[PDB]
Design a protein around this ligand. Structure first.
Ligand SMILES: NC(=O)c1ccc[n+]([C@@H]2O[C@H](COP(=O)([O-])OP(=O)(O)OC[C@H]3O[C@@H](n4cnc5c(N)ncnc54)[C@H](O)[C@@H]3O)[C@@H](O)[C@H]2O)c1
Ligand SMILES: NC(=O)c1ccc[n+]([C@@H]2O[C@H](COP(=O)([O-])OP(=O)(O)OC[C@H]3O[C@@H](n4cnc5c(N)ncnc54)[C@H](O)[C@@H]3O)[C@@H](O)[C@H]2O)c1
Ligand SMILES: NC(=O)c1ccc[n+]([C@@H]2O[C@H](COP(=O)([O-])OP(=O)(O)OC[C@H]3O[C@@H](n4cnc5c(N)ncnc54)[C@H](O)[C@@H]3O)[C@@H](O)[C@H]2O)c1
Ligand SMILES: NC(=O)c1ccc[n+]([C@@H]2O[C@H](COP(=O)([O-])OP(=O)(O)OC[C@H]3O[C@@H](n4cnc5c(N)ncnc54)[C@H](O)[C@@H]3O)[C@@H](O)[C@H]2O)c1
Lengths: 259, 257, 258, 258
């Protein structure tokens, strides 16, 4: 535990599960007053009870929901000091034509547009106040090819939006960065194992360190960038991926040189 | 003029103006049978008359329009050999909160989703046929910071989608690449001068030029052609050195004449 | 039919073999007056006889050789219109400690420093004359991880130097770009097969298009960038790799769908 | 507390001044046993008196110096747990031809080759023991164009080498990452002000946050990556630049909105 965020209001979207839960837990253990924001109130309530945080009902796919949630935070607590955008959904890894356009649309709406909605609603007041730190959650899938024709582009959009906002709000004292997880142990990744969409040993083999990343490891990088340890860092994308991005190019040379 | 695309069916979206028009002109001068596709039927027809191409009514923001256009092409001409995705719109350069969410949505719908709609509708038949070349139009704005919180992310999405498709369809023999224009002289840029200042754009590029639509088209046509037979999944900036020049300010700026 | 150079003077380093040979051949077929430059005069002569170009002895690891070559070009032909830096060497794919420091030093000296030597010697006069186009040869190995602790860094150095020079000389009308080949069929790649450092089917499998790149395919990209068809392109790195950079990230999803 | 190292041995090169000094200081405050390594014993002694660390004479431009220093660390303390490569030099911002080749060579030898020498000498034993964390210092100048035809390429080389080593040694449990500072307040930057090579207000204006980066701010990112809080991070380049990389592209739109 630490006092690094004592007094800080930290809104974490998607905080009921996975990466957002781990960020909420670490921010709370670091002293922050965490707003546990999720569309799933049961999950958010469980996390808030464990962290001492406060729940906020938030559907990032619904403009009215985001606007209302932002107004509730301002009225009840104050201008957010930290915003972490973890709400997101995955997609089936289907090629164009097999992937339903409806599925493509949902991924874009939640993962890119929903992050924009929250940055605008929670972050514009930060720029007005002249202080704040925003951390978005992108993905290695936003950085390289893969069978994710909605999720890849949406996460690449998050990397871009992190850069555009960092330039817009830098002169107003707000830092905006993003973390790009590799394959991270969460209930979403477990559902991929259950549908046989992914295989755990295949994911380990695809990473230079031979590990699947833990939600807590992602949260450490988010909290670093959200904190004053990162006071000079803005507009960056930090991959936390156990070396996934490193390993793929070794196959032409016979693969990683393993134990 | 050349025969490099003799016999090829080349669908160009947004071909009524600007970059798409220059691509249609150069593809036609290179021998292709150009399908001049646009939401603006009068503009498409002017370009088709000049190029010997054929018009195709296409609104990349309407799924039914894209599906019908792809079906017309397949029945009247055949499977496309080349698809160039130039249809697109710009946005007002407003910060979050000032930019209307409706404006953000339109840009994402046309510039990213509309390119996906056309890649799926025209490009899946290419993958089934085991040959084709697709060139998307991104932007330097998809590569660096700027005051375009819809357009930047959408164009970054185009760069990503070019990569994801190149991997999906590489084993089926379809190459997918993208060109990222800098500031390019088109009627859309002229509307910016009447938001943007021409001297400022020249100063922001290492070569001191605004890119012409024809210069963009040369890069598109290179990537679409067999001169690029081993090139897939790449983003080619055609920007007069905009991406190069910004980092010089800390050292006193470009060292000019 | 790829471009027209109208007699432009084009100096190609490493032009006796592989990528440089293919660049010299296509430039000559495209109307350029090619200067076939190489450390191996016998290989340069063979290529120059086939291209109608002229030979130039050039060892990019020897400062005096680069200076003397630039002086010969200036006196005999004039300032170059095009420079293509293809001279290069590979390395054994050994981890640090197994890799001899002497091997590391050679690769850095030839592949990065030697390209800098030629850009300074042949390219500064281009900037003085307010025109020219320079194409460097980097590699996908300068863009991603691999067992190449000298060659990767040197080729990443070439990508950077392309950007730095593009900015220095952009205002003087000189474009500077680079091509990053993937695995390309040359005698240097053949030595990787013979020594069993590389396996041809493994290289095809590692590319989204399932091919090894040909030297001519690299030359087409070099010639495009060197030509007026690329008059607005500067400071860019163009990968020509059959989709090597694309394919590696698919393994986590079960690999390429073949 | 930024991190806890529990007595881990941390070798910091260039630790007598600037970024290396700040890294040594924060590592010591975070519980590491710091080895303050520098070519200048006087500066290293001053830093080590403040950190309780131990001094090591190290010239990263002399192979025998690096080898002897690694042997002394192994003999006196053990295999390093952490290595931070901060030894470096800048260059005059001159175009090719005006920049002496001797100046180009020094920058490449110290900034890229010297980092490779240290990664090989101190890092191969880490891979052998199956544990360690290495942080290299690159620069934003290794990521974008500028008037730095040696320093840009050398620092791009460091970003590459970080990736190549991360792949080589990842399977042996060693993480390798790098930090790319922007303009950072050190004696080296002050020499740029004194020579009027740089102007402080120009550097602030070129960053989205309007600041010059402090040496301590760089050290925080180095210590995060070196620590177990970054146990899943390898092969990455983390810019710490107050938004320099963000700001340049705004000029076309009228500049930053201040
Ligand atoms: N798990 C991975 O391997 C991985 C990898 C890369 C990126 N990511 C990204 O990290 C973030 C979280 O991933 P996760 O693994 O923690 O998934 P998760 O399913 O375990 O948690 C996601 C949370 O987001 C909430 N949520 C979903 N849609 C929402 C909506 N419209 N409005 C509000 N809340 C919504 C969910 O209720 C859920 O609690 C996502 O952006 C994900 O794309 C995850
Ligand atoms: N001009 C530049 O500086 C510049 C820079 C970077 C990127 N781009 C991109 O190049 C592409 C073309 O730009 P331009 O300068 O030629 O603009 P332009 O206005 O001159 O031409 C754009 C064409 O797209 C058509 N179009 C717009 N929406 C459409 C829709 N839903 N369906 C079908 N057609 C539609 C328009 O009718 C028009 O004919 C765009 O993607 C643009 O974002 C332009
Ligand atoms: N073949 C590939 O797969 C591949 C991949 C990526 C990059 N590259 C790069 O392409 C360029 C050409 O490679 P290649 O495959 O054609 O090799 P190659 O052996 O077929 O030809 C290389 C030429 O460079 C000459 N040369 C070597 N050192 C020289 C020196 N100091 N001075 C003058 N000439 C010298 C050689 O005599 C030879 O003629 C190199 O830079 C290489 O690193 C090659
Ligand atoms: N200051 C900046 O703005 C900035 C920006 C980007 C990157 N960097 C990089 O950070 C690192 C340190 O920069 P700094 O500002 O702290 O410089 P500095 O002059 O303040 O300190 C550098 C230290 O490196 C030592 N050193 C130099 N050459 C050496 C050699 N052969 N062997 C051993 N020690 C040697 C010096 O004795 C000195 O103590 C460098 O790699 C630099 O390139 C600095």
């Amino acid at each position: 535990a630490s006092a690094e965020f004592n007094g800080a209001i930290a809104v974490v979207t998607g905080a009921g599960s996975g990466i957002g839960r781990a960020c909420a837990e670490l921010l709370s253990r670091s002293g922050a007053n965490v707003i546990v924001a999720d569309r799933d109130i049961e999950a958010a309530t469980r996390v808030a009870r464990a962290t001492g945080g406060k729940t906020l009902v938030l559907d990032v796919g619904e403009d009215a929901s985001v606007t209302a949630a932002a107004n509730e935070v301002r009225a009840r607590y104050g201008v957010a000091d930290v915003l972490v955008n973890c709400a997101g959904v995955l997609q089936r890894t289907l090629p164009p034509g097999e992937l339903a356009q409806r599925e493509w649309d949902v991924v874009s709406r939640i993962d890119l547009r929903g992050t924009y909605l929250c940055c605008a609603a929670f972050g514009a007041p930060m720029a007005d106040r002249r202080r704040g730190s925003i951390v978005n959650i992108a993905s290695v899938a936003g950085m390289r090819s893969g069978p994710l024709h909605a999720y890849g582009p949406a996460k690449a959009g998050v990397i871009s939006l992190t850069e555009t906002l960092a330039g817009e709000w830098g002169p107003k004292g707000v830092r905006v960065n993003c973390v790009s997880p590799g394959f991270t142990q969460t209930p979403a990744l477990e559902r991929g194992f259950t549908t046989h969409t992914l295989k755990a040993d295949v994911l380990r083999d695809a990473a230079a360190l031979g590990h699947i990343v833990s939600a807590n490891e992602i949260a450490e990088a988010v909290v670093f960038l959200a904190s004053e340890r990162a006071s000079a860092i803005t507009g960056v994308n930090l991959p936390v991926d156990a070396g996934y991005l490193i390993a793929g190019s070794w196959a032409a040379y016979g693969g990683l040189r393993r134990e």
